[PDB]
Design a protein around this ligand. Structure first.
Ligand SMILES: Cc1cn([C@H]2C[C@H](O)[C@@H](COP(=O)(O)NP(=O)(O)OP(=O)(O)O)O2)c(=O)[nH]c1=O
Ligand SMILES: [Mg+2]
Ligand SMILES: [Mg+2]
Length: 430
DNA sequence: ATAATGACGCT
DNA sequence: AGCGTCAT
């Protein structure tokens, strides 16, 4: 009762760029704007595998992982841009640099956690505090929230999207407890005002559109972000959670998209996140373990405590290439030459990293996959990273895997290698 | 025959 | 240390 802790302590946003790789290519090539288009890599195999799809092309059913030859059958006017290739592999530099543009702008507003190349969580608790003080006690106008959705509103006794959005925003703002700087709903509202400002800044200064979720934790902010894509932001209040989760499939919640989520569904005999509330914490801990049990108990009530970590820089820098099917590497010099390609890209990226960020990696991780073997990595081995020298790194990486070579013949490699992966890790102040 | 990456848990 | 899960 007077002591129940309701997970309303923070204001957290998740900002995610809309069809990001497509937007980067579309800013550079105006002929691609506002058309169905996709970004692909490796043109030689069925037109390339699609890794990003504009919303106009999604309306025809084009999805990521589709072959471009197959996507053209769904969308004959689909326009393509292809990832740069360097040293015989995909080169994502252009998108990393675009990502840096966005991240630096978000960093001006608050502490951000870089979560992927195109999204970052934002901890707005302090910033909300400040703006509440600066704003006398004056109402929050709907004009401050021109792209915001209030999830679950409108309710109670218009046929177009923007009309619904406004009605719900009006209902929310009409109900707001403005003379109450402690109310979690007021805090989220002010957080949403700031995220409008952050997204306007991103669009003005980069040309890129994005969406955002605003809620009290990372999981809800990420869920909310996807509710009204593209180019829109969604506020998910604590109060919206029971109805939102009542028909929310379990797999849609961050970290439940895989085997854990599948076992939650099968073991408990449930479909929706809200049905989790019927189980005691001990019961959930008995099926899924102490931390997963506790996490599920709180999460299905809308409560989650994972912090927004102050980290804008990756912890690792890695290069990898697949060699599927008959292209699997089978001679030792083939293995050596690719390791050298990977090491040369890694040297470039590390040197830049050291200049910009004043740190050095100190460990090199070599990972390979074998023909027939099932998993992402078949095998990982590590060694010291003492010099950003591509030839040393590729030689060292070879040294530590070369006795994986089951092959008798002096010049062959068996089993064939279907993946090579070099990763620099364990950064330290430089 | 998606691919290329990245964060982190378990042991 | 080396492996497994989950994600974009
Ligand atoms: C999912 C996914 C995305 N990406 C690259 C390009 C995507 O544009 C960049 C950002 O990912 P996202 O936010 O999951 N997808 P999106 O930005 O293209 O589209 P949306 O507007 O966010 O739904 O992901 C991959 O390279 N492999 C992937 O598996
Ligand atoms: Mg995105
Ligand atoms: Mg994303």
């Amino acid at each position: 009762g007077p002591h129940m802790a309701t997970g309303q302590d923070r204001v957290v946003a998740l900002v995610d760029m809309d069809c990001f790789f497509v937007q980067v290519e579309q800013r550079q090539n105006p002929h691609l704007r506002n058309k169905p288009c996709a970004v692909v890599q490796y043109k030689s195999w069925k037109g390339g595998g699609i890794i990003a799809v504009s919303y106009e092309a999604r309306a025809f059913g084009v999805t990521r992982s589709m072959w471009a030859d197959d996507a053209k059958k769904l969308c004959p006017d689909l326009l393509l841009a292809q990832v740069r290739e360097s040293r015989g592999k995909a080169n994502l530099t252009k998108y990393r640099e675009a990502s840096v543009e966005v991240m630096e702008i978000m960093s001006r507003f608050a502490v951000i956690e870089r979560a992927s190349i195109d999204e970052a969580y934002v901890d707005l608790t302090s910033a909300v505090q400040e703006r509440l003080q600066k704003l006398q006690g004056q109402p929050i106008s709907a004009d401050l929230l021109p792209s915001t959705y209030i999830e679950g509103l409108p309710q109670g006794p218009t046929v177009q999207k923007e009309g619904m959005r406004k009605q719900g925003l009006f209902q929310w703002l009409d109900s707001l407890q403005i003379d109450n700087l402690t109310s979690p709903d007021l805090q989220l509202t002010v957080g949403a005002v700031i995220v409008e400002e952050m997204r306007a800044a991103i669009e003005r200064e980069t040309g890129f559109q994005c969406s955002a979720g605003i809620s009290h934790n990372k999981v809800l902010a990420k869920l909310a972000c996807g509710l009204n894509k593209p180019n829109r932001q969604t506020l998910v209040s604590h109060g919206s959670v029971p109805q939102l989760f009542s028909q929310m499939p379990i797999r849609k919640i961050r970290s439940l998209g895989g085997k854990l989520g599948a076992s939650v569904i099968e073991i408990l005999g449930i479909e929706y996140m809200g049905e989790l509330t019927q189980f005691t914490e001990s019961q959930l801990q008995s099926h899924f373990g102490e931390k997963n049990g506790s996490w599920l108990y709180a999460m299905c009530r809308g409560i989650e405590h994972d912090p927004v970590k102050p980290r804008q820089l990756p912890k690792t820098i890695g290069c990898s290439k697949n060699f599927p099917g008959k292209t699997a590497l089978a001679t030792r010099e083939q293995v050596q030459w690719w390791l050298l390609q990977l090491a040369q890209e890694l040297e470039e990226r590390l040197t830049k990293d050291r200049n910009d960020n004043d740190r050095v990696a100190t460990q090199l991780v070599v990972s390979i996959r074998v023909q027939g073997d099932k998993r992402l990595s078949s095998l990982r081995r590590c060694c010291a990273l003492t010099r950003y020298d591509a030839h040393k790194m590729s030689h060292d990486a070879f040294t530590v895997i070369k006795n994986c070579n089951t092959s008798g013949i002096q010049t062959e490699w068996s089993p064939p290698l279907t993946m090579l992966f070099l990763c620099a890790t364990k950064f330290s102040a430089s």
